[PDB]
Write a protein that binds this ligand. Structure first.
Ligand SMILES: [Cl-]
Ligand SMILES: [Cl-]
Ligand SMILES: [Cl-]
Ligand SMILES: [K+]
Ligand SMILES: [Mg+2]
Ligand SMILES: [Mg+2]
Ligand SMILES: [Mg+2]
Ligand SMILES: [Mg+2]
Ligand SMILES: [Mg+2]
Ligand SMILES: [Mg+2]
Ligand SMILES: [Mg+2]
Ligand SMILES: [Mg+2]
Ligand SMILES: [Mg+2]
Ligand SMILES: [Mg+2]
Ligand SMILES: [Mg+2]
Ligand SMILES: [Mg+2]
Ligand SMILES: [Mg+2]
Ligand SMILES: [Mg+2]
Ligand SMILES: [Mg+2]
Ligand SMILES: [Mg+2]
Ligand SMILES: [Mg+2]
Ligand SMILES: [Mg+2]
Ligand SMILES: [Mg+2]
Ligand code: NA
Ligand code: NA
Ligand code: NA
Ligand code: NA
Ligand code: NA
Ligand code: NA
Ligand code: NA
Ligand code: NA
Ligand code: NA
Ligand code: NA
Ligand code: NA
Ligand SMILES: [Sr+2]
Ligand SMILES: [Sr+2]
Ligand SMILES: [Sr+2]
Ligand SMILES: [Sr+2]
Ligand SMILES: [Sr+2]
Ligand SMILES: [Sr+2]
Ligand SMILES: [Sr+2]
Ligand SMILES: [Sr+2]
Ligand SMILES: [Sr+2]
Lengths: 237, 119, 194, 46
RNA sequence: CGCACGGAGGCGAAGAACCACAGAUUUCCGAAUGAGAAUCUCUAACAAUUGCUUCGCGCAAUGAGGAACCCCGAGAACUGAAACAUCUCAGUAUCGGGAGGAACAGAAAACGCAACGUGAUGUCGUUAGUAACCGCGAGUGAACGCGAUACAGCCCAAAC
RNA sequence: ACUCGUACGGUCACUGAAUCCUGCCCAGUGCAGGUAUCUGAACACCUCGUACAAGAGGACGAAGGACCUGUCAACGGCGGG
RNA sequence: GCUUUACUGCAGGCUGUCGCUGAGGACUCUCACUCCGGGAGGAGGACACCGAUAGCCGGGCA
């Protein structure tokens, strides 16, 4: 047949790419040697085209203008501290060791000094639970207990822009606009509505899949469609 | 480095290179790794010199183990160009050998003894 | 008596034993962080270099080349092919890694001509070969009774035409009798059946 | 369309090539411009 | 005073025309090399990669072309098998790299008419559709030797 | 590439606004988890064999399979008497 | 051209084994190698990646 849509994706053509040239900043944490004497004042609160959540413009003590991931409640004029012995205030970045247990945290690092990987979407938060000299157990937004290094930096508080998923898109045009700002080809034509040549579920006199939808993990790209390695399907049982 | 099992002090090296300069003007010396190796094999070697900055380490690699099974004493020199100048050459030398010393026999004897004590 | 050279030779008979084992473990760490073709002042294997034709003279260059390990890096057929010609994984190239090395070297040095090459080891993913290259234009060679043959017009780009020893060995030209019916005088003359 | 200096020299040449075979060549050879190009009917390069 | 038999005019015995060899000139783009560009332009140029090196582009090399031939790599399918998969078409077509006026080969870790024999290598004739291969199907297919052509044998590494 | 992205994400599919709802079936097929036991290739190892080799047999045994379980808004099924 | 539990194969995924690969049937380590860090240094670690081979799945493709 012909290569399926998921195969055209990896080629990285214009249609499947993200409008990077229209994106503001790659939100990473500031690189401090040691100490704490790094503080800044929030100049502006901007809209980030990349994640739909707001982003805070901060100017530091050493005169560095960089955008940072905005938590809830952080406004213009406010002072945020970054360092080891930073004040345990919402919006401050300090390693997981220094942050007390049972406190909601965002922009958590994987390997210490990477700039933040986990809990970065609108209104989400990671929960810090257990402490040790070796490990800091953080409960990520998916409900998974991630065992992390205590030297991994994290910003205190939940991410701003919460409850975005609550209000519906209502009309196709609103989805259109959102998708034109992301790295996604939209709209989605069902495989079952295509020809046999185009997709494993294409063909027939009526629209139904050919074989069962639950595909094996070992399936090759071109065949791996539908329910990928499903442990189960349905709602009941 | 791989063939070096002991660090020779700067003072002991100064004595050794001084003894080599008077070994050419009185007795006789061998210049070059090939001529050093043949001297250890023919038994006509009293004291053998080997440089520490030899790249590749292969050229000189064999001297420490060969001298041990032939009873010939050896000493390490840090630089290659200094051993060449000491043997009386414009170029450098990876290894030099003293084939029968001359009016330095008493100095060479003590240098051979200072090295054995340094293991 | 034994030459000093014979000791470098005897060491390289077993590159995984003795002092050389430690020397390779150390040197390869620096080599892996070097380029594809790296010119070096002095050969790692002096005996082999001299045996192959190297002289510590002007216009005699040596370079280390790293080429990847394994079979062919081949693309699968995008058109109709019968079962026999549908292979990708088990296909190997007709030129050995030593020859790929010699060629990469001669291209980095468009004025020089390949004299010979030799293996200097491998790790789990790449192989290293040092190539002796000669300057046909330098008078230090044009007057050398041992190396002036390489200055002839017909020796131009000799590696790409398989005129190297590694070339002639890979072309199946070693044997003078039985088994070399389709190799001598050339593979092309024998309809490419070698 | 905007023409360059080289493009102009070429168009200038093509216009000159479009002139008739002089009256005297007919008398010298004792008896046709095969490269007759029209602005509408024919087509130039570029 | 070309093709080219016009008109006007001119050149040649100061030996023109014409032919041979040699030299002068030889715009721009072009490997195209100071940088850019649909043959033009902008402000000293071996651009790039190398060798030597006075370590300065100072001295050099490479690049691209050529009817086919030559050498080194990549490598089909139609087709034949009365289907077809191994096989065949075929190491063919086509593609990548490269040299020369010819290429390649070449002075035995050969042959093995087994000998008390031959004596570098190509090529030609033959050996022979033989040996060998093969859904042992269709098909595929040498060599040693022999007769010729032409002949030519040497240099390193190491020992000292 | 997704990605100046990080689960309020984005990938892969199905259904097709709202409203009222969405029953029963895991035997087959698919996917996934488990598995005492059975089955499960090559390397190495052991036996025979061969002055060596081919080769024959054994031992151990991965994924997978057998077997068990989960799953139908997974393929689909919902009859005869 | 297209389909599949048609024939035969080819990619791909999973898995064992050999090489890279090191010190002291379960375990410790650090020196190769990998990743994070601008750096100091940190995480991981003889595994993973890669090369090779074997078994299973394999209309994704011929
Ligand atoms: Cl969305
Ligand atoms: Cl060459
Ligand atoms: Cl004979
Ligand atoms: K065929
Ligand atoms: Mg970022
Ligand atoms: Mg939605
Ligand atoms: Mg778009
Ligand atoms: Mg749709
Ligand atoms: Mg349709
Ligand atoms: Mg299909
Ligand atoms: Mg429908
Ligand atoms: Mg339907
Ligand atoms: Mg066919
Ligand atoms: Mg020929
Ligand atoms: Mg006009
Ligand atoms: Mg230019
Ligand atoms: Mg047919
Ligand atoms: Mg038949
Ligand atoms: Mg054939
Ligand atoms: Mg024969
Ligand atoms: Mg519809
Ligand atoms: Mg990296
Ligand atoms: Mg098919
Ligand atoms: Na060259
Ligand atoms: Na063959
Ligand atoms: Na026109
Ligand atoms: Na001319
Ligand atoms: Na030039
Ligand atoms: Na220069
Ligand atoms: Na037929
Ligand atoms: Na047919
Ligand atoms: Na066959
Ligand atoms: Na069922
Ligand atoms: Na058709
Ligand atoms: Sr970074
Ligand atoms: Sr980041
Ligand atoms: Sr269908
Ligand atoms: Sr239900
Ligand atoms: Sr030197
Ligand atoms: Sr050339
Ligand atoms: Sr027209
Ligand atoms: Sr002859
Ligand atoms: Sr079932």
């Amino acid at each position: 047949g012909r290569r399926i849509q998921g195969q055209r994706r990896g080629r990285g053509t214009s249609t499947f790419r993200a409008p990077s040239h229209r994106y503001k900043a790659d939100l990473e944490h500031r690189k401090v040697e040691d100490g704490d004497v790094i503080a800044g004042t929030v100049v502006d609160i901007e809209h980030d085209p990349a994640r739909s959540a707001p982003v805070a413009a901060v100017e530091f003590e050493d005169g560095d203008r960089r955008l940072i991931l905005a938590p809830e409640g952080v406004g213009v004029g406010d002072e945020l501290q970054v360092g080891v012995s930073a004040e345990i205030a919402p919006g401050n970045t300090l390693p997981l060791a220094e942050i007390p247990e049972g406190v909601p945290v965002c922009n958590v690092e994987s390997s210490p000094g990477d700039g933040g990987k986990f809990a970065r979407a609108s209104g989400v938060n990671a929960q810090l639970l257990t402490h040790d000299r070796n490990v800091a157990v953080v409960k990520l937004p998916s409900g998974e207990m991630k065992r992390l290094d205590p030297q991994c930096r994290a910003t205190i508080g939940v991410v701003a822009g919460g409850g975005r998923t609550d209000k519906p898109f209502v009309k196709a045009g609103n989805k259109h606009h959102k998708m034109k700002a992301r790295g996604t080809k939209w709209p989605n034509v069902r495989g079952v509505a295509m020809n046999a040549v185009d997709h494993p579920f294409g063909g027939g006199g009526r629209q139904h899949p050919g074989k069962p939808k639950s595909i094996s993990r070992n399936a090759p790209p071109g065949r791996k469609v539908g329910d990928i390695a499903s442990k189960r399907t349905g709602r009941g049982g | 480095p791989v063939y070096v099992d002991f660090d020779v002090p700067a003072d002991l090296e100064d004595d050794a290179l001084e003894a080599l300069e008077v070994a050419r003007d009185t007795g006789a010396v061998k210049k070059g790794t090939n001529e050093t190796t043949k001297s250890i094999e023919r038994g006509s070697a009293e004291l053998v010199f080997v440089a520490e900055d030899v790249q590749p380490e292969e050229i000189v690699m064999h001297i420490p183990e060969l001298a041990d099974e032939k009873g010939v004493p050896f000493i390490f020199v840090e630089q290659q160009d200094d051993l060449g100048h000491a043997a009386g050459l414009e170029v450098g030398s990876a290894a030099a050998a003293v084939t029968d010393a001359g009016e330095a026999d008493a100095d060479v004897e003590d240098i051979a003894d200072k090295v054995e004590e340094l293991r | 008596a034994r030459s000093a050279y014979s000791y470098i030779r005897d060491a390289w008979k077993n590159p995984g034993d003795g002092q050389l084992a430690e020397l390779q473990w150390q040197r390869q760490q620096e080599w892996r962080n070097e380029g594809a073709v790296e010119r070096i002042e002095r050969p790692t294997r002096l005996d082999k270099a001299r045996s192959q034709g190297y002289k510590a003279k002007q216009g005699v260059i040596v370079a280390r080349v790293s080429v990847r390990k394994g079979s062919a890096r081949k693309r699968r057929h995008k058109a109709g092919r019968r079962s026999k010609r549908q292979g990708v994984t088990r296909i190997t190239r007709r030129k050995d890694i030593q020859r790929v090395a010699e060629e990469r070297a001669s291209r980095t040095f468009p004025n020089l001509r390949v004299l010979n090459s030799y293996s200097v080891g491998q790790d789990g993913r790449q192989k290293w070969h040092e190539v002796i290259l000669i300057d046909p234009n330098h008078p230090a060679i044009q007057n050398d009774d041992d190396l002036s043959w390489i200055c002839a017009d017909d020796q131009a780009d000799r590696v790409f035409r398989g005129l190297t020893g590694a070339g002639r060995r890979n072309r199946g030209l070693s044997g003078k009798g039985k088994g070399s019916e389709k190799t001598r005088p050339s593979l092309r003359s024998n309809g490419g059946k070698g | 369309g905007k023409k360059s200096k080289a493009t102009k020299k070429r168009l200038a040449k093509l216009d000159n090539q479009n002139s008739r075979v002089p009256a005297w060549v007919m008398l010298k050879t004792d008896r046709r411009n095969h490269k007759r190009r029209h602005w509408r009917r024919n087509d130039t390069d570029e």
